[PDB]
Write a protein that binds this ligand. Sequence first.
Ligand code: KF8
Length: 93
Amino acid sequence: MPHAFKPGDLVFAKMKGYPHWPARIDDIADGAVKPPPNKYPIFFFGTHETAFLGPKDLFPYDKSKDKYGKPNKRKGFNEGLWEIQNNPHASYS
Ligand SMILES: O=C(N[C@H]1CCCNC1)c1ccccc1
């Protein structure tokens, strides 16, 4: 059975106006800006952006990749697909 989301979990993350996007739940570094309540720091592969999202917009990667893990025209998307498959836990700083 599922747990709550935790740092390191791999997802597709849904934002308004964009396709479901390869992403991971990030840690919050000591000294860094915390997310609002009930939100998670989401690191988007490919664009290397962070947004704060709640679970409604977070789809576990394994379950969802057969639907969402196909190439897309959008800037950074296919790079993102490579990262989540090949080195999802790397520093992209
Ligand atoms: O909207 C943002 N991310 C989208 C763009 C496409 C890939 N990731 C989802 C975003 C977040 C924070 C800073 C700037 C932009």
